[PDB]
Amino acid sequence: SLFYNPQKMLSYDRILNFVIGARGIGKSYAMKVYPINRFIKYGEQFIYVRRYKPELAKVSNYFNDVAQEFPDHELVVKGRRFYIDGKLAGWAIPLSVWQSEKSNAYPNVSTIVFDEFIREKDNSNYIPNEVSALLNLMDTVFRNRERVRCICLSNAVSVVNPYFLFFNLVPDVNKRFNVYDDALIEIPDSLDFS
């Protein structure tokens, strides 16, 4: 995007990624552009995850942000599925009903984007054993550890959320990148222009 460059974050090649403190525009935008490019180039598919169904109420507008980036490609949403040039390229999944979505096929997913993954902030209304649910989703659609990644985004910066607690991640807020063996926490300073 214009102000957020996911290149460095992606270069870490971690299976699990958390980008937080994300101030509105680029992070979410960038993570629409990246998987779309992976499909067009390599046929890699992607899953867009939100916690609850109402968060996907307007998923028909998903490609509007990035439509101008791919003018010569037909970007289509039908229900909760994403199509590029007439081919199934991705899925929108409410994590709350992942168990029901498992009956479907997911041939070549390599990127998962979980936007607004922190219950922000008003109440810890997370799904029971939610981390296990995302984990199950990941193992289901990722064939192996090579060149796959789940990227979780939030405008919040609750350093004590179920995912950080579950995986024993306690980042240093003075660092843009807190690095772990299988996980990464990025706190972008993209919109501090000073």
Curated annotation (Swiss-Prot):
Molecular functions (GO terms): ATP binding; ATP hydrolysis activity; DNA binding; RNA binding
Impact after mutating K121A: 2.5 fold reduced DNA packaging. No effect on ATPase activity
Effect noted on mutating R119A: Complete loss of DNA packaging. No effect on ATPase activity
Region: ATPase, residue numbers: 1-194
One GO BP annotation of this record: viral DNA genome packaging
Binding residue positions for ATP: G21, A22, R23, G24, I25, G26, K27, S28
Primary role: ATPase required for the genome encapsidation reaction. Part of the active packaging motor via the binding to the packaging RNA (pRNA), itself fixed to the head-tail connector at the unique portal vertex of the prohead. Binds and supercoils the pre-formed, unit-length DNA bound to gp3 to produce an initiation complex for DNA packaging. Provides the energy to actively pump the viral DNA into the prohead. Approximately one molecule of ATP is used in the packaging of 2 bp of viral DNA.
UniProt free text on domains: The N-terminus contains the ATPase activity and the C-terminus (CTD) binds DNA. The CTD is likely a vestigial nuclease that has lost its hydrolytic capability since Phi-29 is not a concatamer that neads cleavage.
Name listed for the protein in its UniProt record: DNA packaging protein
Whole-protein residues included: 4 to 197 of 332
